[model samples]
Target: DPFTPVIHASAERLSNIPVYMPKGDPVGLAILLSDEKGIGDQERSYMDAMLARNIIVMPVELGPWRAALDKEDGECNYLDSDFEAIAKEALRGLDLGVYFHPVLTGIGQGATIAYAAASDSPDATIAGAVSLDPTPARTRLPSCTEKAEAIKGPDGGFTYSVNAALPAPALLISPPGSPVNNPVEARRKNIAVLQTAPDFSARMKMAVDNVVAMADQDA
Candidate 1:
């Protein structure tokens, strides 16, 4: 049952989906990746691609406004405080999964999510993280000494810096071409797929289903 995953896939799937587990025997990978809210967005397709590739990916639904306004479960409301912790806590619920860095990160939602991923999993519980365009405000999470040990900069066009002191794996993808906004520009080069709002449960269920189809290689 543990190896068996439950999902309700979509009729149309993304071109890329992960079906193979990572070669390095990584514990898990996560997607700090956000969504357009709801579900069944292009990002979800990407997650499917990663999963089919054998990578166990988890998406952190840290809506910017939600994270900013959140005031429950002993979470710190301040953008800099427990926002990240809350995001990481969300992942902890899954026990073991991967988080892919989000394409957005500022002082608010994105930052807190990235910070939470890095800080909460200081040791090994959290494997490698992929952060996209972490601005100054977001950097505060890394700047904080307690979590600095886990900061892995950026990689590729992305900034990957690792704080081996605490030994956290962080990969920050620079904004497109650097001007900070270039990442968005780079993203423009890809094809665009659109999805309309259905229902929350329906969308989430559909996403899992879509993952199954992708895993089967029929997508």
Candidate 2:
């Protein structure tokens, strides 16, 4: 007899840190699930911390993820059409009654997820998107001109279509010590960029306070 694996629901498992939610409200969350080794859930620590402090976090695991990412696939390949289809089908379920999902993945996964969500519900439900180091899956970062059409895929099979460039209203954060001015560019383009943002200076104090407070509780 062929038996299907049983699924079970257990108590809520959340990050150790607090998830940012406007008190007394419900929010929907959608994560760009990728099985890709380097870009997936476990690898994005800093991004996750910021998002958790701001919204609900969820996993949208896409690839079982291949261990071998060849030279041609060097990160930008996922932005192509075929990968988009996979993400839509593999990770498309969320109920926003009690959780507001803030996205926390970057590169083509970030751009593609944003597009898919918007395509389905153009009016609402796709409230916003945030990404870190959103290099197009077609190219590496720091190249001056983002000519989507000109970016050739490592393989000839991939080509520019529907989106040559990522959409607007995206929140991008640059990690400290980045050679490229992504964080600076994000500040220029978006509402706020942390570390240098107005309140970020105070955020450091707040973090210390929280850490001390937690230690006190343990005491």
Candidate 3:
């Protein structure tokens, strides 16, 4: 049976958690996070692809992150929101109503939320994660091991350092010209990093297809 969605408000933020299930039960769950624009075109692309694969798309509204970004010259501070708790609570609420493998994916700042949730998710249900141009706000500098030092570029510019390890299997997609470090660290972890020259929409589409294939393989 398809688990009916429950729309709820948390701390002034309303989240829509809809379980999309086709005839023969869902094969997996796709935890979908939205960009600053909320459930716009990019997010709709994700929903379309995931639904085609019989995967559940769980959209959790990030109120705290939105509030932080709403400030003048505000940056996205994922730490301000408990995405891990939010995701867990959503899944817990589902209980046995639906059973399927879980994967996380998002675009832009939303990608940052997916990564943070996977990083802190306590259970093994999170099989993998996918991010498109993930930009971590880094409200605070993450603690790094002695081995995780800054990467010096040939021209003396530095690429931001990331943790030596990631929380789960991850696939990061970014444009060849992008400066974000998520792809860099994803490479370090031996995770897949797909760099393309196309715009966000094209790159995101390619990424979605690739990540869904990977998740299906794992499942």
Candidate 4:
């Protein structure tokens, strides 16, 4: 069937974890974190739209997640291996086998979580972190490591060392006049910003396509 039933959190540290399977052979995985209210009508439609583009999605509620992730100096602490486990768990339940390196995404604080997870990882297991209007900007702890420095954009303007040079690529999308500071020069650091965006799924597909291609290196 085209719509694989949404995988409930019936089996699982990972609370509110719901896996939304796509319609075709998957291009990659997107670990979409949700706002404090958890998944709602609008977000589901967004997930469905991404699924139409053949991208499997998993959303974990950020309300409970807030308690799970340690916050240091107002910055959230995370690692890439954490998300990789979530990816393995998702596909394992689907019995669909492996997927390309998963991408992290979210809306509000969830987007912050995505930044922390994608940038502060112990190993390279994520394609990237893409989000719409990532607020606060201070997502991950400012613990500068060689990996973190490697992805820091040329401008060296990230709010923290973790995002200074993200361990993986990052795409920040926002509406016009939004409060977030979207940097165009960060393009060299593998960070991208989209302004006055288009269709939700349309903007997102490009992110998945390009970032996943970077991880795969085969296009």
Candidate 5:
């Protein structure tokens, strides 16, 4: 069954961020962001899919990377409150019987920033980040705003050396046809990077499973 949605149209800070709830207690929560495509029907379609999995989805706009990626000493240093803050704002007074915590996620350019954001999501601040398909060169996210090193990672990707904060688990969903590096590493192991699946749904399944694994180890 499809989950019902209570959307806050023209939400402040970003565009309308729709929150979808499943029939029962949500197993998890995801804060989805749009890629270069911007917020459109595709995000809503994907949100419906996540709802079926009993995962509440709050899809927001493709806000600028600089807004989320704060530059500190010429490096991308995140606020550590972006994702969690958005969740609370979205459900300011709603009672959904679900936690406000969320897993940052997106596709393409959005995916690239999602990975970077997750890198700083240490101490289990947010669950994790699920980067769907990101480009290997740059975010293409308005070159005018991004500097040089802030957009370049060790691998030829848009990672940037922004692991300034604590490290959290991450899931990168890039197929063999187009793969990126497993960028994030924890104290004991690396983030769940380079993990791919057959398609979007399956990829999302694995991402969801990744979060489960995080809890299994009580991360």
Candidate 6:
């Protein structure tokens, strides 16, 4: 099986992460933050594609995520810097080789978190980020566009816009004809958005390939 369960080492917080490593040394590393479904069903197909390319993938679950449904904003607004810090710390302690590039990727709300972690965290050696069907915070407008569109939250506060000027380059994937698909504007801001794939699973595989290719170019 390509899926292998591995422990994310931390003196205090221990996470039983799953790492999919191929036969030999990996060409790159992808930290996958999957949705509630985890790595089941078609998600495994996406991982299978990456494994074929010799990219090591580690899936981490950091939630009983309910913010999207619980909050009026319809998006998870938690931006704890410790999340990325802890991931990096665990990876460092695990002693994964330094020969390959490190990248962040996620699906659904996980995509939002991966995008934020890549853009907001200043210390991670992230080569790039890949987001699959990202869910934008309803309250805050996405920064990929020039204008910021904000709305009032149920909490009586306004949600700010995501910073368009992201730190690292990113790739965002969305289903064809989806309203949130914004390849033109995203490209303008150094974020590549692709929505022409045949389906969701194909798009995910493409996203992983693109991210790995970009990381290889950086080498």
Greater-TM-score candidate between 5 and 6: 5
Off by over 4 Å in 6: 10-14, 65-101, 136-163, 179-189, 192-194
Candidate numbers, best lDDT first, in rank order: 4, 5, 6, 3, 1, 2
Taking the tens digit of each residue's C-alpha lDDT, what string does model 3 give over 1-219?
433454332332324455554344566667676775667777777677666766656764444445643452432222323434444555566564654446778777677555554554444556666777766533222212123233434554222334434446666667777544456556567443545646776776766675566557656
Each prediction's whole-model lDDT (CA): 0.34, 0.31, 0.55, 0.58, 0.57, 0.57
User: TM-score: which is higher, 1 or 4?
Assistant: 4
Q: Say which prediction, candidate 1 or candidate 4, comes out ahead on lDDT.
A: 4
Which candidate do you rate higher for TM-score, 1 or 6? 6
Misplaced by over 4 Å in model 3 are: 1-16, 22-24, 64-98, 120-123, 136-163, 179-194
Best-first order by TM-score = 4, 5, 6, 3, 1, 2
Best of the two (4, 5) by lDDT: 4
What range of 10 consecutive residues in model 4 has the weakest lDDT sum?
A: 137-146
The prediction achieving the highest lDDT against the true structure is 4
What is the C-alpha lDDT profile of model 5 across 22-80, one tens digit per residue?
A: 77666777777777667666566666666666676776666553453333244334434
Residue range 71-115, candidate 1, lDDT tens digits: 234423222233233325433443445443212121223433453
TM-score (all chains, Cα) for each model: 0.39, 0.37, 0.62, 0.70, 0.68, 0.68
In model 5, state the lDDT of residue 108.
66
lDDT against true structure, model 5: 0.57
lDDT of 4 at 159: 37
Q: Check candidate 2 and list the clashing pairs.
A: 27-99, 27-100, 28-101, 29-101, 33-60, 35-63, 76-137
lDDT for model 1, please.
0.34
Q: Of the candidates shown, which would achieve the greatest TM-score relative to the real structure?
A: 4
Residue 91 of model 2: what lDDT? 28
